[PDB]
Amino acid sequence: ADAGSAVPFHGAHQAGIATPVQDRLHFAAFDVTTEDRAAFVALLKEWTAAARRLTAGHAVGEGAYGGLPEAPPDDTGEALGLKPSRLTLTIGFGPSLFTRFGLADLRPEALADLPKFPGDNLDRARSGGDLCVQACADDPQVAVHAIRNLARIGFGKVVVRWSQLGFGKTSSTTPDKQTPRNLLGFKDGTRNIAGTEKDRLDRFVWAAEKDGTPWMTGGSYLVARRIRMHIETWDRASLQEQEDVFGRDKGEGAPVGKAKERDEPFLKAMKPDAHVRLAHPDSNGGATLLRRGYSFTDGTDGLGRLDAGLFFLAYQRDIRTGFVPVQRNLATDALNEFIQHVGSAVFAVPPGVRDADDWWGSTLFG
Amino acid sequence: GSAVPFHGAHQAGIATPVQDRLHFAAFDVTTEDRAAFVALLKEWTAAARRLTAGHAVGEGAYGGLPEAPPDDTGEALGLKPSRLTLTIGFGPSLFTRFGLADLRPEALADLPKFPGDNLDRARSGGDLCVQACADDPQVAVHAIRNLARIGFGKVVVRWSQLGFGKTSSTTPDKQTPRNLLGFKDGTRNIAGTEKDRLDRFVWAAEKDGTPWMTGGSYLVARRIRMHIETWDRASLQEQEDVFGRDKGEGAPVGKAKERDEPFLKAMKPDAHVRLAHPDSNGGATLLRRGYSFTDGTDGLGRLDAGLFFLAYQRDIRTGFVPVQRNLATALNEFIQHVGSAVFAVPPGVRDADDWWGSTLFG
Numbered sequence: 001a002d003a004g005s006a007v008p009f010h011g012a013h014q015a016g017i018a019t020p021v022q023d024r025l026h027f028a029a030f031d032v033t034t035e036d037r038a039a040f041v042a043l044l045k046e047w048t049a050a051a052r053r054l055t056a057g058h059a060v061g062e063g064a065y066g067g068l069p070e071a072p073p074d075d076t077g078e079a080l081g082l083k084p085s086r087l088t089l090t091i092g093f094g095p096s097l098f099t100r101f102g103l104a105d106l107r108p109e110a111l112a113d114l115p116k117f118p119g120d121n122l123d124r125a126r127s128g129g130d131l132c133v134q135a136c137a138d139d140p141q142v143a144v145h146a147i148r149n150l151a152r153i154g155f156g157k158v159v160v161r162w163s164q165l166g167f168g169k170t171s172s173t174t175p176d177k178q179t180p181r182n183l184l185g186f187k188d189g190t191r192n193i194a195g196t197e198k199d200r201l202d203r204f205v206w207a208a209e210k211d212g213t214p215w216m217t218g219g220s221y222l223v224a225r226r227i228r229m230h231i232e233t234w235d236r237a238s239l240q241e242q243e244d245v246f247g248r249d250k251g252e253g254a255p256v257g258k259a260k261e262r263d264e265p266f267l268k269a270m271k272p273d274a275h276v277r278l279a280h281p282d283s284n285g286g287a288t289l290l291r292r293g294y295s296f297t298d299g300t301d302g303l304g305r306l307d308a309g310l311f312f313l314a315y316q317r318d319i320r321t322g323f324v325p326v327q328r329n330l331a332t333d334a335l336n337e338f339i340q341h342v343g344s345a346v347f348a349v350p351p352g353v354r355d356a357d358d359w360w361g362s363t364l365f366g
Numbered sequence: 367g368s369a370v371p372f373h374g375a376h377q378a379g380i381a382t383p384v385q386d387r388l389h390f391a392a393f394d395v396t397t398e399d400r401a402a403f404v405a406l407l408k409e410w411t412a413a414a415r416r417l418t419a420g421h422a423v424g425e426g427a428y429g430g431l432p433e434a435p436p437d438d439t440g441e442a443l444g445l446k447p448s449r450l451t452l453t454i455g456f457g458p459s460l461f462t463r464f465g466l467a468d469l470r471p472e473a474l475a476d477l478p479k480f481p482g483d484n485l486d487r488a489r490s491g492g493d494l495c496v497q498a499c500a501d502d503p504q505v506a507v508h509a510i511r512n513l514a515r516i517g518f519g520k521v522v523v524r525w526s527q528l529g530f531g532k533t534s535s536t537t538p539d540k541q542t543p544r545n546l547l548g549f550k551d552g553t554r555n556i557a558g559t560e561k562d563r564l565d566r567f568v569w570a571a572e573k574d575g576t577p578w579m580t581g582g583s584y585l586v587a588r589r590i591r592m593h594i595e596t597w598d599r600a601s602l603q604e605q606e607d608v609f610g611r612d613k614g615e616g617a618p619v620g621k622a623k624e625r626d627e628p629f630l631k632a633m634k635p636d637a638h639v640r641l642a643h644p645d646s647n648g649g650a651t652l653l654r655r656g657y658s659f660t661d662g663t664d665g666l667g668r669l670d671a672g673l674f675f676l677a678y679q680r681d682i683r684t685g686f687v688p689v690q691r692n693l694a695t696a697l698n699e700f701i702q703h704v705g706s707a708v709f710a711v712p713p714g715v716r717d718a719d720d721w722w723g724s725t726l727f728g
């Protein structure tokens with residue numbers, strides 16, 4: 001999809017995972033406030049109909065104006081005149097959802113609670129959530145409009161628990177395109193899974209019927225981690241230290257000793273605690289992740305410095321065999337000196353909306 | 367890759383085309399040493415020359431001595447200049463330092479308290495500001511991040527605000543952007559093409575009484591939160607009554623097209639456009655150059671969003687103050703001013719030997 005165009009909303013999988021990574025992110029986690037299973041199903045269907053309009057660049061409901069003068073417009077209007085901008089909307093269900101609506105026995109085993117990791121300082125207010133909507137678009141206003149209108153449609157049935165805006169991507173599903181840099185100045189996304197690698201996506205990303213939870217076939221599992229960066233500490237590190245931390249050089253992003261970004265890492269030349277060496281599939285029994293995160297900055301830290309961070313998003317076939325073993329291996333990561341995980345959540349991302357009659361979560365509910 | 371010339375009689379970023387993104391930072395000065403601060407302005411000017419041309423600051427982001435921290439933090443490598451402009455301004459509190467008290471312009475007036483103000487001290491004020499605008503937010507953020515790093519030990523960041531306007535890769539150029547209330551925003555503004563109106567309403571002139579400010583301007587910044595969820599429950603007629611323009615076309619009530627000149631008597635008496643219009647304010651006219659923001663959601667699940675309002679004018683006492691005073695009475699139901707600062711924005715950097723603030727510090 002070129003700039004401005006729409007990303008197809010229907011498919012066997014939800015868009016927004018293997019889709020090329022859009023420039024902007026608006027991630028919202030919602031808690032459910034209704035106990036009425038029928039009312040929540042009706043919300044899912046109303047949300048699905050809204051998403052069809054939004055991802056096509058159309059206003060929700062009857063439109064943003066022209067209705068009865070005395071009624072609030074159905075669409076809040078601030079995306080009027082804008083292109084779809086590659087908007088994708090990806091819904092996920094958190095483990096806490098399954099304490100409601102009789103869903104207990106339907107919780108996927110792959111939707112594992114994450115253990116505590118060393119160094120965690122998780123803010124419980126910006127963690128968890130019954131469900132999430134990841135809105136990705138090339139235009140921040142398009143992404144905000146989608147989240148705001150979904151929240152407004154859901155009034156009385158869901159409330160926003162927390163949200164995170166990402167001002168630029170730090171990830172790549174398109175190795176044919178330039179790899180974006182994170183706020184530490186390193187390319188981020190070189191060795192990820194590409195949207196064209198159908199076999200790798202089947203192996204590492206999509207849930208299969210044989211994995212034990214039939215309603216999740218074709219979905220995925222999402223781990224979100226809000227990671228603060230100690231940029232004061234990083235920025236006084238020498239160039240050699242920074243490159244040692246990762247195992248790739250800063251300018252080209254090539255593995256140490258090699259000349260080109262996409263040359264294969266030779267792990268034994270990296271320091272034993274180098275990030276790439278510790279996170280590489282070959283260090284983790286083959287565990288492989290689809291990374292899809294974004295940078296953020298939320299003002300200052302009150303101590304005279306810019307706040308900076310990375311909103312880490314990983315998709316995987318099974319949280320127990322993707323993020324958990326890799327993150328456990330990062331216990332000795334040289335990068336730990338410069339980061340702190342401050343928020344966390346996991347979600348089961350259901351399969352795609354197959355056609356115009358289908359709806360988000362229809363295989364769970366149905 | 368489009369770039370905006372850094373040098374000029376005026377700083378860029380004021381009359382030059384409005385870029386898609388904003389990173390605004392207010393800094394406090396932590397040194398008492400005038401010479402050290404002047405040294406900093408020169409290094410900052412050298413860095414700004416590099417940044418606005420799309421080059422790394424100093425010796426670069428890599429390829430130097432391995433034992434040294436790189437001069438540039440590296441996260442804009444591979445990106446375009448993205449029309450980056452960097453505009454510096456000096457707050458009233460700066461003039462209590464360095465012996466400058468008698469050089470504060472009278473046009474750099476303290477703002478009165480206005481009805482409904484709910485100003486957060488931590489997001490207000492500041493000894494100086496850097497307005498970084500660019501089409502790529504990572505270019506803007508990189509600029510602020512590196513200027514702050516270069517200044518470490520002499521300045522700290524007091525507060526910062528990210529914002530967005532239109533996305534120009536997808537949105538036509540003669541299309542007015544919409545603010546987060548869904549209304550076109552910017553129809554009746556001073557355009558950068560209007561040289562005469564800029565001279566009359568925006569640029570400080572030497573006759574105004576502060577010679578070092580000639581060719582500069584005065585900036586008012588207001589962080590204005592919108593009560594989004596309340597606004598979204600209002601009727602379309604209520605929303606249009608608040609502004610005096612229709613929501614779809616943005617035409618003044620009773621007219622057909624967005625750029626039809628308004629008939630103020632057809633608007634309700636406390637409609638925003640009627641109260642803000644120059645005809646209601648003795649001719650007072652502003653250059654608005656603000657950006658929307660959405661910082662997330664507050665503790666009650668509400669959208670922390672609004673307008674980071676920026677107004678440039680020849681004299682704060684005859685620009686923002688009389689217009690904001692006249693807004694004392696229908697948009698106020700839906701907004702709250704929660705941060706404020708004023709800055710004297712000096713004249714432009716004339717050439718490669720000149721530096722930010724040279725007319726003030728000599």
Ligand code: HEM
Pocket residue numbers: 182184186187188189190191192225227229246248265275276279280281289310312323326327330339
């Ligand atoms: C602020 C936090 C982080 C930063 C700045 C960061 C940065 C990087 C960089 C610069 C690379 C090399 C380029 C690339 O292949 O993408 C990389 C690779 C990688 N990272 Fe991270 N990372 C962070 C967090 C994490 C976390 C939390 C995980 C997993 C739990 C992770 C897993 C990986 C993986 C799997 C790779 C690819 C390794 C390979 O196969 O070669 N990263 N990261």
Ligand code: HEM
Pocket residue numbers: 545547549550551552553554555588590591592609611628638639642643644652672673675686689690693701
């Ligand atoms: C969140 C806050 C605000 C919003 C959403 C808002 C919105 C608007 C809109 C929709 C218009 C009509 C279209 C246009 O000509 O731009 C307008 C006009 C205008 N506004 Fe505001 N505004 C806000 C705050 C302010 C403030 C604080 C001031 C000055 C103190 C101001 C001064 C003006 C002026 C001078 C005009 C042009 C009036 C004319 O000459 O026709 N606005 N604004």
